[PDB]
Paper text:
Nanobodies D12, T2a, and T27 recognize the same epitope located on the edge of the α/β-core region, including the first residues of the Walker A motif and the last residues of the Walker B. Although these nanobodies belong to different sequence clusters, their mode of binding is remarkably similar. While nanobodies typically recognize their cognate epitope via their highly variable and long CDR3, these three nanobodies interact with NBD1 not only through residues from CDRs but also through their (conserved) framework regions. In each of these three nanobodies, the CDR3 adopts a β-strand configuration, further extending the overall β-sandwich fold of the nanobody. The CDR3’s contain one of two acidic residues that form an ionic interaction with K606 in NBD1. Hydrogen bonds are formed between acidic side-chains and backbone amides, for example E608 in NBD1 with backbone from D109 in T27 or from D111 in D12, forming a tight set of polar interactions together with the aforementioned ionic bond. In summary, for these three nanobodies, the large interface can be similarly decomposed into four main contact sites, where specific interactions (electrostatic, hydrophobic and H-bond) are formed, extending over different subdomains of NBD1, covering over 30 Å in its longest axis. In addition, the regions involved in binding are highly similar in spite of protease treatment. For example we measured an overall RMSD below 1 Å for the Cα’s of residues involved in the binding interface shared (see below) by D12 (where no protease was used), T2a (treated with papain) and T27 (treated with subtilisin). Interestingly, nanobodies D12, T2a and T27 stabilized F508del-2PT-NBD1 mutant to the same extent as 2PT-NBD1. Incubation with saturating concentration of nanobodies D12, T2a, and T27 and strongly reduced ATPase activity to respectively 50, 50 and 30% of PKA-phosphorylated CFTR, demonstrating nanobody interaction with the active, phosphorylated protein. Nanobodies D12, T2a, and T27 are predicted to bind CFTR between NBD1 and NBD2.
Cystic fibrosis, is a life-threatening autosomal recessive genetic disorder that originates from mutations in the cystic fibrosis transmembrane conductance regulator (CFTR) gene. The most prevalent mutation is the deletion of a phenylalanine residue at position 508 (F508del) within the first nucleotide-binding domain (NBD1). Although it functions as an ion channel, CFTR belongs to the ATP-binding cassette (ABC) transporter superfamily from a structural and evolutionary standpoint. We report here the development of nanobodies against NBD1 of human CFTR, characterize their interaction with the target, and demonstrate the ability of several of them to thermally stabilize CFTR by 10 °C or more.
Numbering used by the authors:
A (entry chain E), C (entry chain A): 443 to 478, 487 to 637
B (entry chain F), D (entry chain B): 1 to 121
């Protein structure tokens, strides 16, 4: 229905205004209808009752090295250390309530920690400030995840410049699909 | 050309109040996520208060209820009401805006020149 | 996080008002975050440019008998026969425009034609009349898909009665999870 | 007890017009889909016009612009304005409603007793 491809090892940025259809497109991809295994990061955070570590490693085997790279890249090193129980802090049981930004960073850490074929990151920086967003975008989405197949929902030109392919949506339909160079001619 | 201009900065005594304003010009499509940042001398730029892309408000840990971020959507302005000013609040305060620069909702981040806020006894 | 299970070969009915979180929960399942391969039928139809046949078999090998059964079960026999080109009728290229109900039936036929581990049918009967819905629910969801793992988004008591397990959501949270008998002991 | 009551049925001549009404009683929560069905003697019940669950309207192939389905949300009523009545339109016309019977949005489908519509020259 939408003409685009998902290239192996590349960053596809999905841009558009609110209501354009970005979250639906992600659902069409996971549902195996689009473009015509999955590590998902929802636009509103997700947390399960359990520790910060249990939330990030999420039932998979613990890898000391990957875990600590993911905590560093998702700007969570400082937040965790400030808790007396650190990574072993318990969430979702009426106890500690994190900020929207902390929850967003934990949601992204869970998504990048997972060994998946396709990474779907639906607006992961929407509840973060512009400085934190730039640090996570560069260290995590660009560096750590450099050869992973990523679909990042973002409308930031700064981000689009670093994407391998861009898909611009308008009211559930594609407007543009191509490179940043190809996008640059228009407007 | 999109331009942001901060005003309202100045010298204040501890416990004083100040109101920072940020005017915009050359906005064709609108603004999303307007915010306030600061850099203290010889320190790295940090968040003060911002409206997020999700329409919510995010304040830095040091604000402790003293500051308020307001917005005028019709004028495309952002404000920072500051109270209980401390010597630690001395910094160049910068205005930030994620401006919609396309009819498809594509954005560019713009910064102001900054306004000096000096808190001294 | 929602407390529920997806039991192999069973029908799980996901009930609740508008905004309860029903579509979001399907996205959490496809995104592999819940509950703790996929054949998806979206609540708004999906069509790709191509024939009626191409839209149903959707890239997989054609099986005359499997196709015949699905078409009969999704109430598509009468619709297809009324087209001069029938099954080879071309959709989505400015030509033939189907009704919301026809598009909904194709969408469902594509989902049941697929050989998958889990079938996610998000309100497939929302654009259908009550009589067509009853015929499809009984002959397709209940009979044709009898030992498939199905998650049907429905709030109809008539469907809930036939489900193996029911999940009622309220404002993003679970209210009830259990059998129709368990639900009845709350009336 | 949820109850549906059709009215407006009767004898009409070809080219005539009729208006069918369907009143409801005992509705605690709300009604979602409402609509009109019919069955001629020795024939299977069929759709005439209905409000889908989505909020859209769905008409049967035989309607050909002649009939209109309306709804009054405040009164919980459904209507069928019929024009250009043909002898083939002779049937018992039934009213249908998907009634919300729980505070969690669970529904039950209810039918009326039916009203006779006879089109004869
Ligand atoms: N093939 C299709 N046919 C009809 N509608 C479609 C199709 N594909 C997508 N859509 C529509 O696209 C819409 C997308 O809504 P969505 O929640 O994903 O918005 P959004 O872009 O992510 O906004 P936000 O930035 O606020 O998250 C849906 O309402 C859906 O009906
Ligand atoms: N862990 C979580 N934290 C915060 N929000 C959540 C969580 N899980 C689910 N949600 C919320 O669930 C909501 C999903 O709404 P959804 O569109 O799925 O409604 P719906 O019941 O499908 O209604 P419809 O009848 O229109 O299909 C989202 O708005 C999202 O914020």
């Amino acid at each position: 229905d939408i003409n685009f491809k998902i290239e192996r090892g590349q960053l596809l940025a999905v841009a558009g205004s609110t209501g354009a259809g970005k979250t639906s497109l992600l659902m069409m991809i996971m549902g195996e209808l689009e473009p015509s295994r999955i590590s998902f990061c929802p636009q509103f955070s997700w947390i399960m009752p359990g520790t910060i570590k249990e939330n990030i490693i999420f039932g998979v085997s613990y890898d000391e090295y990957r875990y600590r790279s993911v905590i560093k890249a998702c700007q969570l090193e400082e937040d965790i250390s400030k808790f007396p129980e650190k990574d072993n802090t318990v969430l979702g049981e009426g106890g500690i309530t994190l900020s929207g930004g902390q929850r967003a960073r934990i949601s992204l850490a869970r998504a990048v920690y997972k060994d998946a074929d396709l990474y779907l990151l639906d607006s992961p920086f929407g509840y973060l400030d512009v400085l934190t967003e730039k640090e996570i975008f560069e260290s995590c989405v660009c560096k750590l995840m450099a050869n992973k197949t990523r679909i990042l929902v973002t409308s930031k030109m700064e981000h689009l410049k670093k994407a391998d392919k861009i898909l611009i949506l308008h009211e559930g339909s594609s407007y543009f699909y191509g490179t940043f160079s190809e996008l640059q001619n228009l407007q | 050309q999109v331009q942001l201009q901060e005003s309202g900065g100045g010298l204040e005594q501890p416990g004083g109040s100040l109101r920072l304003s940020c005017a915009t010009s050359g906005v064709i499509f609108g603004i999303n996520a307007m915010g306030w940042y600061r850099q203290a001398p010889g320190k790295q730029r940090e968040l003060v208060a911002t409206f997020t892309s999700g329409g919510s408000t995010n304040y830095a840990d040091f604000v402790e209820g003293r500051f308020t971020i307001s917005r005028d959507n019709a004028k495309n302005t952002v404000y920072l009401q500051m109270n209980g000013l401390r010597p630690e609040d001395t910094a160049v305060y910068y205005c930030h805006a994620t401006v919609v620069v396309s009819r498809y909702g594509l954005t560019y981040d713009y910064w102001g020149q900054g306004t000096q806020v000096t808190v001294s006894s």
